[PDB]
Structure formats: structure tokens, C-alpha cells
Amino acid sequence: TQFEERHLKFLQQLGKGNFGSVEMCRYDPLQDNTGEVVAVKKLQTEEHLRDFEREIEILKSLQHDNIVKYKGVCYSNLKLIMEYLPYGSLRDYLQKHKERIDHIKLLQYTSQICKGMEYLGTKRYIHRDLATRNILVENENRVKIGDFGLTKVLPQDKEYYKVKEPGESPIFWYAPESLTESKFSVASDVWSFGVVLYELFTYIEKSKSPPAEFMRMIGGQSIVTHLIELLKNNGRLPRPDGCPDEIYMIMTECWNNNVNQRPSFRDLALRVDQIRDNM
């Protein structure tokens, strides 16, 4: 399905980053306000352009209930057209609607994230950026992974990917081996999933955020250096208040220093599903 620029009508900025923006647009070839609302990602380097071309093809290759839908591309620079999900990021949804979201609902979302991550796994894709800000809410009962800007394809013969990036990284979501050796794997995605579970069960309360807690535990060396040393000494995020024992246990296993001792996404889905039924 082709998208002409001339019919792409700017409605609102959804987000602006470094090197990228996302906009709500109406695709309106009949110019009567009837056309479909879509999300449009675009660049705001040759290196960022390369990453974006690869990001488009990664998303185009994904078809899953819990992955934001690829719709197409729009050229003049390149724009990536996606389905618009009206409730926005899980991060913002949960801050807004937390008084109406119980533990059962959190475990529903958790399950769906695990299924999307399991599917990424089958393509040998490493997300690298698993955070509630990168998950989207389609409705009360469905979330989707909604950004693939850092996603890498494993080499054919290796279980990890080493990255040379000099930009800001979401370090308070990163596995120790990601921080020390820039090694990214399914196991570093599982570490990051543990931090997502933490975000959900703290209800995105600012005073309990991963950066708040890590900086409190840290107190002339970079924050990265202090964080590696703290994780090496088995410093961890604390149990969220009222977090069920089996959910805290899942988080602590995700945060094993040893990549090879972290759970599989298939196992996580099963264990989350069982906690949810048990409740």
C-alpha cells in the first residue's frame, strides 16, 4: 500500500527524541477528514539514516498481535508509517489510569510483552530498548511493542551482538555485560524485561523509578562506572510495594549477573500466565 506525502496531514507530535520524531497524521487522499489516522516516524546523519533503513525492514518483517503494525513508507527524507494506537505508551497510560489497573491487568500486559519478545527471539532480533515507554496500548486488553529503533539481528554464528554506539543509552535498563562490553543478547533483553516488570509493579511512580533508585544506591567516576560496580556487588532494585513474591522472584532471576542463568521468554510467559490464573 503506497502513501503519497501530499495526502499525509500532520495532526500532532506524539514524541520527539534525538535523531527521530513520531507524528499522528491523517492519510487523506479524499481530503475530507475521512482518511485513516497513522503514526509517522522520521529523522530530525548517514549513520542514523542507515539505522533507520534497517529499522524499517525489521518492522516490515514483524507480524504479531503484540508488535505495532507496519503500514508502509513515504518518500520526499524517508518516513515510516505505522498504525496509530490511541492510548499511547504503557508508561503514560499507567501513570494516567493506575487507579483502574490492578495486579491482574499488569500481568495481562506482562504476558503480551513476553509473547512479542518470544516472537522477536524466533527472528534472532535483539530489541536492546525494552522499557514501558516503548510499549503501546491499543486498548484496555492489548499492548504492543511499539519501537525497534535499537533492534539488531544476531550474526548467523553468534548469540550476542556487540555495538559501537557513542549516543546516550538507557543504562538503568541495561544488563551488566551491556554496560561493560556493549554485548546485547536475548539474555540482555530478559534483564531489561525484569526492569519493565519493576516499572509496571511500581506503577511508574517517579520516586521509585529505576534512575531514582540506582542513583540513591550510588550516592570522580562516571555514573556508568558506579552502576557496573553496584551491579557487580549484587545491588538490585528493591521489591515494589505489594509486588507478589513470585513476581519479585521472576525479576531477581532476570537480573542474574550470569547471562546463562536468566530465564527464557517462553518460561517467563508460562510463569506470568500461571501467577495471573492463581490470582
Ligand X SMILES: Cc1cc(Nc2ncc(C)c(N3CC(O)(C4CC4)C3)n2)sn1
Residues that bind ligand X (CB under 6 A): 14-15, 22, 39, 68, 82, 84-85, 88-89, 134, 136, 146-147
Residue 14 among known ligand-binding residues? yes
Task: Give yes or no: 273 in active site.
Answer: no
Q: 21-27 and 8-16: which strand pairing?
A: antiparallel
Give the residue with the Cβ less far from its own copies, 32 or 99: 99
Q: Which of 129, 147, 245, 267 is catalytic?
A: 129
Residues that bind its own copies (CB under 8 A): 98-100, 102-103, 106, 201-203, 205, 207, 238-245, 279
Alpha-carbon distance of 150 to 18, in angstroms, equals 13
Minimal distance, residue 238 CB to its own copies, in Å: 6
Q: How far is the CB of 196 from its own copies (least distance, A)?
A: 16
Flag whether 22 is marked binding.
yes
108 close to 141: Cβ distance less than 8 angstroms = yes
| 20 annotated as ligand-binding | yes
Nearer to ligand X, 41 or 115 (CB): 41
User: Residue length, the chain?
Assistant: 279
Q: Per the annotation, does 232 bind a ligand?
A: no
Tell me whether residue 15 is annotated as binding. yes
How far apart CA 59 and CA 82 sit, in angstroms, is 9
Neighbours of 165 (CB within 10 A): 11
Q: Tell me how far, at minimum, the Cβ of 17 lies from ligand X, in Å.
A: 8
Residue 106, H or E segment: helix 103-122
For residue 229, how many other CB atoms are within 10 A of its CB? 12
Report how far apart, in Å, the C-alpha atoms of 278 and of each of 35, 116, 227 are. 44, 23, 36
The smaller minimum CB distance to ligand X, of residues 101 and 217, is found at: 101
Residue closest to ligand X, measured at CB: 88
**Residue 203 CB, nearest distance to its own copies (Å)?**
4
**Within 13 Å of residue 31, how many CA atoms lie on the same side as its CB?**
4
Question: Which residues are the active-site residues?
Answer: 129
The annotated binding site is made up of 14-22, 41
Tell me the binding residues for ATP: 14-22, 41
